Design a protein around this nucleic acid. Sequence first.
RNA 1: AACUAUUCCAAAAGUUAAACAACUAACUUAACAUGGACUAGCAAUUUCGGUUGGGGUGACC
RNA 2: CUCGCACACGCUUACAUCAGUAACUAAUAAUAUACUGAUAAUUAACAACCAAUAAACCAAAACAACACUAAAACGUUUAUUAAUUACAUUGUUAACCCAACACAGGAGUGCACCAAGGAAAGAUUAAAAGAAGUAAAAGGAACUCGGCAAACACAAACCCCGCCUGUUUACCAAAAACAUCACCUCUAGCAUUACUAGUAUUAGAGGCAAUGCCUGCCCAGUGACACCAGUUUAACGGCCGCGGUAUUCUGACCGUGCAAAGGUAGCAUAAUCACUUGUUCUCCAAAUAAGGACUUGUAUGAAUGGCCACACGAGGGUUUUACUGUCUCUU
RNA 3: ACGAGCUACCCAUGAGCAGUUUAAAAGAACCAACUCAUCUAUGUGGCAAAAUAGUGAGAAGACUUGUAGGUAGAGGUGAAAA
RNA 4: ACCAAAGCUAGCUCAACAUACUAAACAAAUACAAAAAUACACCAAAAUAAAAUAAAACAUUCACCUAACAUUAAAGUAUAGGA
Lengths: 122, 159, 393, 46, 240
Amino acid sequence: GADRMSKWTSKRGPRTFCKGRGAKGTGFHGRDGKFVQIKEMIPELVVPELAGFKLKPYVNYRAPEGTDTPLTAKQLFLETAAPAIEKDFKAGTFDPEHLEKYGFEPTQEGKLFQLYPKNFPR
Amino acid sequence: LGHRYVNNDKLSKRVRKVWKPQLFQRELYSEILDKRFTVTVTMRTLDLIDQACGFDFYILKTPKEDLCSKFGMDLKRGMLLRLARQDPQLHPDDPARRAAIYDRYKAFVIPEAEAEWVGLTLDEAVEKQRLLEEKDPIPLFKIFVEELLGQLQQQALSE
Amino acid sequence: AYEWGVRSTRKPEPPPLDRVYEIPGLEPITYAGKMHFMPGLARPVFPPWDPGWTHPKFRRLPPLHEHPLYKDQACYVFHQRCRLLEGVKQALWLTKTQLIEGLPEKVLRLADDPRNHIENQDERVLNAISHARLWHSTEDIPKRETYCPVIVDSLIQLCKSQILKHPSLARRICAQNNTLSATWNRESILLQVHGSSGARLNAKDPLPPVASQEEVEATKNHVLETFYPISPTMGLQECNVYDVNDDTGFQEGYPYPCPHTLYFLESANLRPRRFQPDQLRAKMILFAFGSALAQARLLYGNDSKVLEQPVVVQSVGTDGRLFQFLVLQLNTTDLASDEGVKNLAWVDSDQLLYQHFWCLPVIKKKVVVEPVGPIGFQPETFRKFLALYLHGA
Amino acid sequence: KARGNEYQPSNIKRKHKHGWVRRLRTPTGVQVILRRMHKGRKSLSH
Amino acid sequence: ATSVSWKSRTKYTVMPVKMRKSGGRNHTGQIQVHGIGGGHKQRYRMIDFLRFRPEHESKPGPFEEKVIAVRYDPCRSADIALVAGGNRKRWIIATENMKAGDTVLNSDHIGRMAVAAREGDAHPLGALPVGTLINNVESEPGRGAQYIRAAGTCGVLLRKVNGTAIIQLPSKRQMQVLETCIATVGRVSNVDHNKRVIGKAGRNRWLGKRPNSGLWQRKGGWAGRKIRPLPPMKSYVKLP
RNA sequence: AACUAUUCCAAAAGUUAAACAACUAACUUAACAUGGACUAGCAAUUUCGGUUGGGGUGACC
RNA sequence: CUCGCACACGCUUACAUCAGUAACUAAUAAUAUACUGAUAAUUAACAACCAAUAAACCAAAACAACACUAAAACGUUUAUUAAUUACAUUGUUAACCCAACACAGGAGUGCACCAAGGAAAGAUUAAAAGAAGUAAAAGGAACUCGGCAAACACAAACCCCGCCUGUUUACCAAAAACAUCACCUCUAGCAUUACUAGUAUUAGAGGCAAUGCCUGCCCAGUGACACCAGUUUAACGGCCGCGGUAUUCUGACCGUGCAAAGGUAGCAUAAUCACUUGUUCUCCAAAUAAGGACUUGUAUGAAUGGCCACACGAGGGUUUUACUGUCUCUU
RNA sequence: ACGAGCUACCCAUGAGCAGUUUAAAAGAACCAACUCAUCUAUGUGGCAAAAUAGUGAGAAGACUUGUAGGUAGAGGUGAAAA
RNA sequence: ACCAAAGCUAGCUCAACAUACUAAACAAAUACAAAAAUACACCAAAAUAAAAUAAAACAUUCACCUAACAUUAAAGUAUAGGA
Ligand SMILES: [Mg+2]
Ligand SMILES: [Mg+2]
Ligand SMILES: [Mg+2]
Ligand SMILES: [Mg+2]
Ligand SMILES: [Mg+2]
Ligand SMILES: [Mg+2]
Ligand SMILES: [Mg+2]
Ligand SMILES: [Mg+2]
Ligand SMILES: [Mg+2]
Ligand SMILES: [Mg+2]
Ligand SMILES: [Mg+2]
Ligand SMILES: [Mg+2]
Ligand SMILES: [Mg+2]
Ligand SMILES: [Mg+2]
Ligand SMILES: [Mg+2]
Ligand SMILES: [Mg+2]
Ligand SMILES: [Mg+2]
Ligand SMILES: [Mg+2]
Ligand SMILES: [Mg+2]
Ligand SMILES: [Mg+2]
Ligand SMILES: [Mg+2]
Ligand SMILES: [Mg+2]
Ligand SMILES: [Mg+2]
Ligand SMILES: [Mg+2]
Ligand SMILES: [Mg+2]
Ligand SMILES: [Mg+2]
Ligand SMILES: [Mg+2]
Ligand SMILES: [Mg+2]
Ligand SMILES: [Mg+2]
Ligand SMILES: [Mg+2]
Ligand SMILES: [Mg+2]
Ligand SMILES: [Mg+2]
Ligand SMILES: [Mg+2]
Ligand SMILES: [Mg+2]
Ligand SMILES: [Mg+2]
Ligand SMILES: [Mg+2]
Ligand SMILES: [Mg+2]
Ligand SMILES: [Mg+2]
Ligand SMILES: [Mg+2]
Ligand SMILES: [Mg+2]
Ligand SMILES: [Mg+2]
Ligand SMILES: [Mg+2]
Ligand SMILES: [Mg+2]
Ligand SMILES: [Mg+2]
Ligand SMILES: [Mg+2]
Ligand SMILES: [Mg+2]
Ligand SMILES: [Mg+2]
Ligand SMILES: [Mg+2]
Ligand SMILES: [Mg+2]
Ligand SMILES: [Mg+2]
Ligand SMILES: [Mg+2]
Ligand SMILES: [Mg+2]
Ligand SMILES: [Mg+2]
Ligand SMILES: [Mg+2]
Ligand SMILES: [Mg+2]
Ligand SMILES: [Mg+2]
Ligand SMILES: [Mg+2]
Ligand SMILES: [Mg+2]
Ligand SMILES: [Mg+2]
Ligand SMILES: [Mg+2]
Ligand SMILES: [Mg+2]
Ligand SMILES: [Mg+2]
Ligand SMILES: [Mg+2]
Ligand SMILES: [Mg+2]
Ligand SMILES: [Mg+2]
Ligand SMILES: [Mg+2]
Ligand SMILES: [Mg+2]
Ligand SMILES: [Mg+2]
């Protein structure tokens, strides 16, 4: 009676059925029928030099935790744009038209990593 | 859609029957929209157009329920818009004809906010209203900047 | 007239546009807003899409007229695979050439000298045939696609074995798949023989002209036969994008400048995908001619003139059991007029290297009637082959 | 002759006849899926 | 479900093109015509039924073509001929004695003197003698041949009246046409196709015919020998 | 009944004379196609009264 | 003793190693490919995935020389553009699948007939009856519905019905039923989804059953054409009496009634209501069987076809030989 | 609503047919694989919801057969056996 | 003496109220043969409910039968029906 419940996988069908397990495509099919890899699609791991740096996978037990404050858009506004805006309004140099000097970005399409359509994996 | 008795004797067979209107291909001229549409109409439609004395009259002069067509309501929405706007593009060359025509229909003229909602399905309406309300959510940088300017201008005015 | 599509197939005419699009001064409301189809709303119309940066693969095919090499003169091209309706007639007419039955007598004298035979001819050639037709494959009965090039190459080897006795034969080099472009103008019709042949034997030194002056002058009085209903261009490729430049497949300063012999194989399994023997003859006429013409315009130049120094090229062609021999002498670079001196071609046609071949013993009433091997063998055809190979020395 | 072996398995046939896509390509099929959803079936379709 | 007809190929080709038989089934898949299916596999040769077809629109004049070969065709009863002129070849339906290496004239030109009719010649009806034998007959001018294409069939031109031709179809019915319509002169190929004897049920299967049903039906009123006065004459001439 | 063909009347589009005699009618119809009829095909719905020296036939009511 | 190895399709870890099996799976144990647990495992070169648009090509596969008819699967080259840059992704176990079972069943292809696979018997005893086999004195169908089955035989003849190869009631009918070449009727004058990319030597709706000799008479009824007349039977269907006569049984002849025509040719006790085991000849020692004739069959009979015939038939009957445990009569 | 993965008939696309006899691949002949299912005996809650053993019929064809697709119940399909 | 026996919980049922009415969970993947990141299109649609049954058969008829308007009465009245 075949099998209803067990999931549908490349192991199950005929020769003609190949369904990946969910790894991401690195390329396309070329002229010779041979497969071509696109160096840009292959994720390049960015790994910092860890050797000269002191932090460890675990933390000392007598070391204290702290009162837990989730970072909010407000707190981030106040630690960054608030001192600068206050400095330039107190000096009357404040310009409601261009906020770009404070770090505000009008549109995301220029820069490499955009936040809203979210150009980057991790 | 219904049933009939054959022979009209109640004692005969009872039988499903459907009575279909006789349809015609006729091209009609709209003055206000200045156009000839090729429309399927009935003899009844032609008689009502005759009775209301104009094609455009018939379309303006009849309620939504009596036309029954979505196309009728769109014709009406169109020329109602052309009347409330007094659209110059009607007859670009001759303001004489334009004023002459816009004249006879002056009884049906309705404001603009009303005129674009007349012939609308609930679907089309909901869509339209969704498009008028379409806004990209305002960056929190803006809002926080305005709160901060409020606070700074009340710190400056207090001393 | 009866048109050749069928309504059911031709891509469906666009749905009749929504009625809200006939009403002047009115904005239709569409599902275009929601980025997906909805019933109850009008179908949106979109501008033909322009992805401002063009992608090499996924772009629409560039129309032909946009090319830098586009020209309004239709040029008729003959490439490796074209079939001519009237084969040798057409070939001759396009080439301005007279046909002669046998091979040149120089070549025949080269063929009948017992000095020019190999060690054991009948033995070695029977072996070459058997090898090609049977022994060279794992399978019982090899297909033609394998055994045609094999037998031509076996024979080329048998002849190459004579480099010991006449050591001028090392002055030659073999080439495969060269671009060949020869453009010429004939009777207001523009012709170009363009493409690749299979295999080409090139020499360092040119080939001595094989026709006495009597032949060349008897050529002046010869009238070209004509096929009235059929245009001479029939079977060629009408082409609107082409280059007119003389191109032999090699750049300047090629150590082996002089085409010697062209080899044309028909290796195809199906009959209909091969050439009729006649069409094949035509093919090698045209191609030999192109090969010649290129050279002729290299050593002399684009000016159209009768030649004080004729150019000679040879060609061989095959079913693999059946050979076509051709020798061509090019006397003329002006083909525009019909009335001058004509080029010369000797064609030895339909020369059987062997009658038939049996790969399995044929048995009748539990006895062996016919053994494995070739039936009938013409040493003559190989002799002619050798001759054409030996024409340089 | 002898019966009961009527079912001769093929995955292509299985999924073409009874599969998800096949059930969504027609209104009736969609009503099948809807009924099964209603009853709370573990497997809506093949 | 829905099947697509094999009959879509836009450009004309002399080369045999591959076709799919469908035994009696419409595009819905039900049987429409009983008793059809599974003959030998067949390729289809495209036939040009418009005999007068100027190669280029540049030179309109009456032109002449050579007959290259006369071949068997699986699709129809008549034998067909490969005909070439200018740069183009086409298949046409071969007349009875048409042989390879032949010459055939195609002409739209009328004239007061008529014409001496050869076989493969195509002329407008007006241009022929009044007793001639014709095949591949157009209905309206420019339409292409429909009538009288079967093997060994011939119609006959009966008379010419009022810029119009009246001809006699193989069913012995009369047909009236403008005299500007083209027809080919002669009897169609393969005249003995009538006398061919299918030897065994098998051969009938080779021809793609499935056997009759087995049900016994009592003959009805329709059967008998009906002797009907020959029908009135068909006229494709449109009166003003 | 529907459906499929036939035939006809009406609907719809038209076209003609200014009609005839003395001191309004008639005709037309390409494909669709409506309402009402006609003739068939293909069909739709429904039923097999009782008595009886078992039922049936016959007879009877 | 011999259904073996692999692939496809399918199955989905049932495979492998170590350990355990009181009980659970094996129709029983031993122990374990099938129960239990833990731990592992199939690695791409094979396979899947793996370009479009124009243009030249009428020329079968059959060892393909060349042809046959039913007219036939399978590609080159030329031009125009085709991201150009190691290593992508996925199938890889098995003793397996479909039959409720570890089912004598069903299962495509390539290679093999052994080099690979396997075990008919848990242990006895040697009653009947039953199954399967080998042998049998004398006889040789006397058995029996029938030579069913069997046999050291593996041959000849004759009828009936169907011409023939073929098809059919999967699971009680394989036939004399159906189809079928052939022959006949009807209906159609024509274009982009069937018929058909066809065109009356064609295509549909049917009848009948090759071949051979034939296919008689009837249009009143009922149909169908012709919208009424009239035409149609290779349309549905029909095709008779009573009295008197040759010395005598018969009735060429005569009378008369009724019909639209009055059953013609042929064949005939038939696969043909009954009478019927008709009568006679042949075959047997003996026949309601078989064959041949006679034959009113008052209910045969001519394309709902009639008569002969070749070849053919797991059709239904009959004779001869031969063979035999079918039987005498069993062992 | 769901069903043509069985089966009836189609459409695409593949695959098989050795030996012998014959001028012959002729819906010829002998006889395997293969396909059928004649006659008998077993079996009859069986090995089997149609099998086993023997015996038979066809075996280059109106042949067998794989894969994918089609036709759906007032229907389909049918070399009519409802 | 075996096989067995005994529980009182899991939850349910019917109403009331009620805001208002597609719960929960969504990182990725999901309408290729659902759970398979990535290429030039198509997309979509409606036609009266019928019958079993009651009428002791059945032929016109046969409440309710997936259409908001409740309740006390008028009233099983006027009417409708092979009356
Ligand atoms: Mg299941
Ligand atoms: Mg798979
Ligand atoms: Mg697999
Ligand atoms: Mg790679
Ligand atoms: Mg089952
Ligand atoms: Mg055909
Ligand atoms: Mg033919
Ligand atoms: Mg028939
Ligand atoms: Mg019949
Ligand atoms: Mg009723
Ligand atoms: Mg009764
Ligand atoms: Mg009674
Ligand atoms: Mg009684
Ligand atoms: Mg009694
Ligand atoms: Mg009675
Ligand atoms: Mg399983
Ligand atoms: Mg294990
Ligand atoms: Mg156990
Ligand atoms: Mg394996
Ligand atoms: Mg035992
Ligand atoms: Mg015993
Ligand atoms: Mg015994
Ligand atoms: Mg014995
Ligand atoms: Mg004995
Ligand atoms: Mg006896
Ligand atoms: Mg006895
Ligand atoms: Mg026997
Ligand atoms: Mg015997
Ligand atoms: Mg015997
Ligand atoms: Mg028979
Ligand atoms: Mg049976
Ligand atoms: Mg069967
Ligand atoms: Mg049989
Ligand atoms: Mg049986
Ligand atoms: Mg019969
Ligand atoms: Mg006859
Ligand atoms: Mg007969
Ligand atoms: Mg008769
Ligand atoms: Mg009559
Ligand atoms: Mg009559
Ligand atoms: Mg007799
Ligand atoms: Mg009798
Ligand atoms: Mg009788
Ligand atoms: Mg009859
Ligand atoms: Mg009879
Ligand atoms: Mg015979
Ligand atoms: Mg017999
Ligand atoms: Mg038989
Ligand atoms: Mg039989
Ligand atoms: Mg199937
Ligand atoms: Mg054989
Ligand atoms: Mg045979
Ligand atoms: Mg058996
Ligand atoms: Mg036995
Ligand atoms: Mg056997
Ligand atoms: Mg046999
Ligand atoms: Mg036989
Ligand atoms: Mg299917
Ligand atoms: Mg019923
Ligand atoms: Mg039916
Ligand atoms: Mg069948
Ligand atoms: Mg019957
Ligand atoms: Mg019956
Ligand atoms: Mg009742
Ligand atoms: Mg009751
Ligand atoms: Mg009842
Ligand atoms: Mg009801
Ligand atoms: Mg009343």
